[PDB]
């Protein structure tokens, strides 16, 4: 079934040059992404059956159904729609996005794995409302990042609880909650912080030490320190290593 023009019936009944380009291009995209999934240790899609489909549908060498329309296909109904492959895979290939919009839930149940691989722009798994629940109900869970990993509760508690060990490790230092003990080991020091020089005095030669005078020091390295003298004309303390500071001033009267 084709919305492709074959003007004046000039051509084969089954000329599907553009349908074949669409099939070739989709399988080409599916195959490049299957290589990307392997490189990323994701579960690979079934290229094998989508490769036979190209064989079957190209010139309809096997009794399949090829729907092509150069300007888009809509399959709509008020009632349920079913796209089902009995023994093989369903492949939804897209040049742009694949957008699923559910007025109710969007659910996936896979007897094998579920792998969502994003290649360039990351992954957003958001729940605007409702509880997010991520479970390895019978196995390990691994949440890994190359750069910074941030776990945050913006208005509630964060509870990390293990059954046999809870280890926090970074750079030789570790905190292990295990047995009934707590172990804080490190090569360096364990620091419990349970608590959380030099300038000028601009004075007139008569003796009155010129208050409220703007100043700015330039240490002899390339750092600048503005300020205003104060109530007998103090300067800010300076602590550059071994410099020869320089001074300038102006102000009001």
């Amino acid at each position: 079934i084709s919305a492709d023009m074959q003007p004046q019936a000039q051509g084969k009944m089954l000329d599907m040059d553009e349908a074949i380009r669409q099939l070739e291009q989709a399988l080409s995209l599916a195959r490049s992404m299957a290589k990307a999934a392997t490189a990323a240790n994701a579960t690979q899609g079934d290229i094998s059956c989508q490769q036979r489909l190209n064989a079957s549908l190209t010139d309809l060498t096997a009794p399949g159904m090829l729907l092509h329309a150069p300007d888009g296909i809509g399959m709509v109904s008020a009632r349920a729609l079913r796209i089902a492959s009995g023994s093989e895979s369903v492949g939804i290939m897209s040049g742009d996005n694949t957008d699923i919009t559910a007025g109710q839930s969007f659910t996936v149940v896979a007897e094998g794995a579920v792998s969502l691989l994003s290649r360039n722009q990351g992954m957003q798994l958001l729940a605007a409302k409702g509880r997010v629940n991520i479970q390895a109900q019978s196995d390990d869970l691994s949440m890994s990042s190359q750069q910074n990993l941030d776990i945050q509760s913006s208005e509630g508690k964060v509870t990390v609880s293990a059954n046999q060990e809870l280890i926090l490790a970074c750079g030789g230092a570790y905190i292990k909650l295990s047995g009934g003990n707590i172990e804080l080991g490190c090569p360096g020091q364990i620091l419990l912080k349970s608590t959380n020089g030099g300038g000028f005095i601009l004075t007139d030669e008569a003796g009155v030490p010129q208050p409220s005078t703007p100043y700015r020091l330039t240490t002899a390295e390339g750092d600048i320190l503005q300020g205003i003298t104060d109530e007998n004309g103090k300067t800010a303390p300076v602590n550059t290593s071994i410099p020869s500071v320089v001074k300038v001033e102006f102000g009001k009267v």
Binding site: K35, I47, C49, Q51, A55
Partner: protein
């Protein structure tokens, strides 16, 4: 040059004072025992080839890589089943491993020993079928690793036979033998001993349990006995699922310091596509000997066994065509092509001596074509297929014993110590037809091991040998449900979730183009 200790203070107790008792020992001079581990890398032995190995042969030999579509491939299967998996026999690596003289307990002044280890062949699932085909692809290197663990446990057994030694192992030598992918594994192992691999030293040490041995820590190779090096039987290059995996780090090149003596026999009459020879010709002694692959290596069943080798072979790829039901089958393009290639094969010097011992014909097939449209036109149609067929019943496997004896002579020249073949070894005694020929072949072997060029077999002896030579190459089609091959590109797609009910067809024993075996040199 070595000395042990006459120790009698061999106990002490455990205390809280942490005491160190004493060991009083007058020093005993220890024997310097040159120990040789015979390494025997088999091809497929008296076993069946596993699925993963048989699937590798789809690479470049799929029915789809040829012009054989899924209907023509099924017609080939049907046409062969109308005329007439495989478990092989013991190879020469089995018989060399049997005749390798093992020494369980050293003599009181025995200065040289020999223990042996036997590593099996590479080919002996669904989700895991891709990684199992990868295992077969890397089987050479993984077999050398298995050789490490095998050397460890062979050494542990040997020294557990000699408790409380009075001898020091003054050298670790290696006698590595191989067949056809254990020949590749043997060459790789001989290189790993040439590179003085640390895993070999770890294996020797773990077997000796920390004992001392005076030599190269990873040993040295004395004699490399190769039978027909075939680094790979098939490949992964066309498997979509696994062709990304690069070639394994296999080292087959045998530099002048890789072994003291190297000698390889080769199959003159091996022409299969998948069995491409890795030659050591020009570089090391290599003896081209008449016979197929396993007529050099041995894995053919005896002429009386139930697994008797009966050859019902397509010597041409069956070609089919639909014609008129009036057309005489011999007046078809397929029959003319088949007779043409049959006359080519009778002219072919490759099978010059094999064909006179069997029947070389052109089989013709014709089935009915249901074409309802042409029925209305009054045209009834038939599909006539024709190929060159070769029958040869009861092929004797007694040429492998000639090659076995040539290997034994080569190795015994290298100093390797073998138990002679006595008449209790009835599997290894030659027919009276073959005694003179076995002797001439041993002489050719020595002439090559003397650097000369051997006195080649004459046309009468070669005709005598053609009776014992198997035709390994054929166009008999096989199938599998674990793969799907792209009919256009010939790319193989492993069925990961079980067979989809299809059949992928392969010509695994397909002869190389023009019946000249590919040889890779170095």
């Amino acid at each position: 040059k070595y000395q042990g200790y006459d120790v009698t203070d061999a106990t002490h107790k455990t205390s809280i004072h942490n005491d160190w008792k004493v060991v009083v020992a007058k020093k005993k001079p220890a024997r310097g025992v040159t120990l040789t581990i015979g390494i025997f890398f088999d091809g497929t032995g008296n076993n069946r080839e596993n699925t993963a190995s048989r699937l590798m042969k789809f690479n470049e030999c799929s029915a789809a890589r040829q012009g054989v579509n899924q209907k023509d491939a099924q017609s080939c299967e049907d046409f062969l089943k109308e005329i007439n998996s495989y478990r092989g026999y013991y190879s020469n690596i089995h018989w060399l491993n049997i005749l390798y003289h093992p020494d369980q307990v050293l003599k009181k002044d025995q200065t040289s020993a020999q223990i042996k280890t036997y590593i099996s062949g590479i080919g002996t699932i669904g989700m895991g079928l891709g990684t199992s085909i990868l295992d077969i692809f890397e089987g050479v290197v993984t077999k050398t690793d298995e050789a490490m663990e095998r050397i460890t446990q062979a050494l542990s057994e040997f020294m557990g036979f000699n408790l409380s030694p009075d001898f020091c192992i003054a050298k670790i030598q290696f006698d590595v033998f191989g067949f056809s992918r254990g020949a590749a594994a043997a060459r790789h192992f001989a290189n790993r001993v040439m590179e003085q691999d640390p895993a070999i030293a770890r294996a020797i040490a773990k077997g000796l349990r920390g004992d001392f041995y005076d030599g190269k820590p990873s040993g040295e190779v004395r004699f490399l006995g190769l039978f027909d090096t075939v680094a790979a039987i098939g490949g992964i290059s066309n498997f979509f699922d696994i062709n990304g995996r690069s070639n394994p780090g296999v080292k087959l090149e045998l530099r002048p310091s890789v072994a003291k003596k190297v000698f390889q026999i080769t199959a003159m009459n091996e022409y299969r596509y998948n069995f491409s020879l890795n030659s050591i010709k020009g570089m090391w002694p290599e003896l081209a000997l008449p016979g197929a692959h396993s007529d050099i290596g041995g894995g053919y069943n005896p002429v009386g066994s139930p697994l008797q080798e009966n050859e019902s072979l397509f010597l041409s790829c069956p070609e089919f065509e639909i014609v008129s039901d009036d057309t005489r089958e011999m007046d078809t393009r397929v029959y003319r092509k088949a007779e043409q290639v049959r006359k080519m094969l009778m002219t072919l010097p490759a099978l010059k001596h094999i064909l006179p011992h069997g029947k070389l014909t052109t089989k013709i097939r014709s089935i009915g074509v249901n074409n309802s449209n042409q029925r209305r036109a009054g045209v009834i149609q038939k599909q006539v297929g024709a190929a060159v067929f070769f029958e040869r019943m009861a092929v004797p496997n007694d040429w492998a014993n000639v090659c076995l004896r040539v290997m034994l002579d080569a190795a015994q020249e290298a100093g390797v110590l073998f138990e002679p073949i006595r008449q209790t070894n009835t599997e290894l005694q030659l027919p009276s037809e073959l005694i003179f020929l076995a002797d001439k072949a041993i002489a050719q072997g020595k002439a090559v091991r003397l650097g000369q060029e051997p006195q080649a077999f004459t046309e009468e002896e070669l005709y005598i040998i053609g009776k014992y030579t198997h035709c390994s190459a054929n166009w008999n089609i096989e199938s599998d449900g674990n793969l799907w091959v792209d009919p256009t590109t010939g790319e193989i797609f492993i069925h990961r979730f079980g067979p989809k009910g299809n059949k992928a067809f392969v010509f695994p024993n397909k002869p190389n183009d023009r019946w000249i075996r590919s040889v890779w040199y170095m």
